[PDB]
């Protein structure tokens, strides 16, 4: 946990400083409300079991931000390859992430830091 990490003088992860697991869960849920309501992205998830996806994304996002969560899903590149996702789509998604983190009360600078962790992933997500 955060305490035990501080006991070992490690630095505080983004995970810990946005509020940890409960925070990830709040964010991911608002995230998907947003995406699924955007007709520019909606259809990417037409054939998707969202309940499953959401459990997966909570683990992946939590781990990406330094949390102790296991990721039990598939590799990003295998998942996203073939799905015709462009940098345009990726950016729209990142915008919904940023809005969800704003809605939850996370400081702008920290949101920018989080995008700095996620953006690189575009290499694996996008078709290009
Ligand atoms: C870099 C940001 C993103 C991350 C971290 C991410 C992460 C994930 C994860 C963890 C899964 C579940 C993998 C599994 O089932 O084992 C997933 C699947 C999926 N992602 Fe992403 N994703 C990102 C961006 C996007 C974008 C931009 C789109 C489309 C606009 C997208 C569309 C999808 C779809 C349709 C699936 C699941 C297909 C299905 O099984 O129904 N993702 N992604
Ligand atoms: C990908 N959600
Ligand atoms: K695929």
Swiss-Prot record:
Gene Ontology molecular function, alphabetical: heme binding; metal ion binding; oxygen binding; oxygen carrier activity
The record's free-text note on cofactor binding: Binds 1 heme group per subunit.
Cofactors demanded by this protein: heme
Keyword Metal-binding annotated: yes
Domain of life: Bacteria
Keywords for this protein: Heme, Iron, Metal-binding, Oxygen transport, Transport
Matching SUPFAM superfamilies: Globin-like (SSF46458)
Transmembrane segments: none
Residues binding heme, per UniProt: 80
Family: Belongs to the truncated hemoglobin family. Group I subfamily.
Assembly: Homodimer.
Function, as annotated: Binds oxygen cooperatively with very high affinity.
UniProt name for this protein: Group 1 truncated hemoglobin GlbN
Taxonomic source organism: Mycobacterium tuberculosis (strain CDC 1551 / Oshkosh)
Protein's gene: glbN
């Amino acid at each position: 946990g955060l305490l035990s990490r501080l006991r070992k003088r490690e630095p505080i992860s983004i995970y810990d400083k946005i509020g940890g697991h409960e925070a990830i869960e709040v964010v991911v849920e608002d995230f998907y409300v947003r995406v699924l309501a955007d007709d520019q992205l909606s259809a990417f998830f037409s054939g998707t079991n969202m309940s499953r996806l959401k459990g997966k994304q909570v683990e992946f996002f939590a781990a990406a931000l330094g949390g102790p969560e296991p990721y039990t899903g598939a590799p990003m590149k295998q998942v996203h390859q073939g799905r015709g996702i462009t940098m345009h789509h990726f950016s729209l998604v990142a915008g919904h992430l940023a809005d969800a983190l704003t809605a939850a009360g996370v400081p702008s600078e920290t949101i920018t830091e989080i995008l700095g962790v996620i953006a690189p992933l575009a290499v694996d997500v996008t078709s290009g």
